[PDB]
Amino acid sequence: RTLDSHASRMTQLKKQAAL
Amino acid sequence: TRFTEEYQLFEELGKGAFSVVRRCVKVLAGQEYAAKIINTKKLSARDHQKLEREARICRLLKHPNIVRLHDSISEEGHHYLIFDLVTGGELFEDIVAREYYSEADASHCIQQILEAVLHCHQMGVVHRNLKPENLLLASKLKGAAVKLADFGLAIEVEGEQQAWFGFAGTPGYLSPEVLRKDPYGKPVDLWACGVILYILLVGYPPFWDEDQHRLYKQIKAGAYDFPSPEWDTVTPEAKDLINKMLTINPSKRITAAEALKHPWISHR
Numbered sequence: 430r431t432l433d434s435h436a437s438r439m440t441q442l443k444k445q446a447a448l
Numbered sequence: 449t450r451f452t453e454e455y456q457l458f459e460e461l462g463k464g465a466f467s468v469v470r471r472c473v474k475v476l477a478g479q480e481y482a483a484k485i486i487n488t489k490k491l492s493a494r495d496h497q498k499l500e501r502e503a504r505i506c507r508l509l510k511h512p513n514i515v516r517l518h519d520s521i522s523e524e525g526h527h528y529l530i531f532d533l534v535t536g537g538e539l540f541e542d543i544v545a546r547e548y549y550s551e552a553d554a555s556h557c558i559q560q561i562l563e564a565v566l567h568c569h570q571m572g573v574v575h576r577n578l579k580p581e582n583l584l585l586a587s588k589l590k591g592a593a594v595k596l597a598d599f600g601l602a603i604e605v606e607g608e609q610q611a612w613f614g615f616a617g618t619p620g621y622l623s624p625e626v627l628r629k630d631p632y633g634k635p636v637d638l639w640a641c642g643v644i645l646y647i648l649l650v651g652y653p654p655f656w657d658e659d660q661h662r663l664y665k666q667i668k669a670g671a672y673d674f675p676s677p678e679w680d681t682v683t684p685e686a687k688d689l690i691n692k693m694l695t696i697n698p699s700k701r702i703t704a705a706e707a708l709k710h711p712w713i714s715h716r
Contacts, residue, residue: 435678439547439651444540444581445618447601 449523455483455530465600466490471533481518482531489525498600499527505599506531508571513564515584515597534595536585539648543580547651548678551686551712553591554648559713560594561641566704568596569634577601577617578640580647605633610698619663620653624696627664635698638707642693649686650678654694670696685712 431437455472461482462469472483486499506517506529518530536542539557543549549557561583568575575582577598586593603613610633615626623639625632646654654672657663666672672694674687689712692702707713 433675435650435675438675438678441652441656442544442647445579445620447577447618448616 449521451521451523451526451528455481455528457483457485472530480533482515482533484529484531486527486529487525488522488527496522496527502600502602503529505573505602505604508573509568509599511564511567511596513560513593513595514567515595531597532595534584534586536587536592538581539583539585539594540580542585542588543647543651549648551649551683554645554686555712556591557594557648558641558645559708561596561644562704562707562713564594564596565637565641566708568602568637569704572605572607573599574603574605574613574634575599575601575637575640576603576613577621578637578644579618579621580644583644608633619660620655622664622667623698624668624670625698627668632698635701635703638693638701638704641704641707642690645686645693646672646690649682649690650675654690668696670694683712685710688712 431441454474454476456475458471458473460468460470466487468485470483470485472481473479474481488496503517503520510516515534516532518532521528565575575596582596582598584595584597601616610631612629612631615629617626621640621643623632623636626636643653643655655663655666657666674682679687689707689710693707695701702710
């Protein structure tokens with residue numbers, strides 16, 4: 430769950446595998 | 449065989465797949481390389497072939513912004529792909545470290561990325577798995593070079609001929625055409641440049657959801673935007689490029705060559 434703040438959005442940035 | 453004769457291993461750099469990466473040196477030349485060591489007694493017949501597809505493609509690609517493959521070697525028990533050594537770590541980590549890039553920096557990074565992509569495409573190679581994890585930095589210095597890696601998903605296209613080359617890549621970076629199971633071609637990698645450029649600017653992707661289905665729905669719909677206050681300050685030009693990269697219709701999308709002429713890349 431993300432807030433409506435830059436810094437909260439920036440936690441969406443996650444590494445992701447293929448497929 | 450020929451590898452244990454000519455090179456000499458040192459420290460582990462990476463794990464991932466059955467593939468251990470380790471720094472090495474050609475004992476004649478004194479020259480340092482990156483060696484991708486693959487356990488092969490752990491690997492089937494076609495997956496010895498999938499890996500030789502990968503070498504064959506790395507060999508087609510001589511570019512300043514593509515990790516050069518210098519020599520592939522099948523010894524009994526292991527395969528060694530021998531790459532340019534590149535110590536700057538993933539662009540992914542550098543974004544995280546720095547939170548976001550300046551437009552100046554993003555512009556200089558995506559420029560190198562697009563140039564590589566352009567080259568990939570003229571050589572009839574479509575990456576299909578672009579993302580900041582598959583982008584290695586030369587050094588950590590606030591502008592240094594950027595090179596493509598992991599053509600482990602890379603396809604050969606004949607001309608601007610589109611086709612179903614199947615469903616593969618990373619979820620966040622997938623093109624609308626790929627999710628729909630429509631035929632596709634070179635443009636699927638300009639979509640990825642869209643996602644990446646967006647990330648490069650504000651520290652997070654234009655599409656995300658912990659539920660994968662919702663994610664794939666966001667992509668198809670091309671449901672991104674420019675939230676405040678971060679995008680409030682970012683040039684209309686930058687947004688424009690991202691908008692032409694994240695065009696839902698592949699035909700109406702910007703091409704690598706087009707993207708390189710776009711004002712946010714060539715100023716003055």
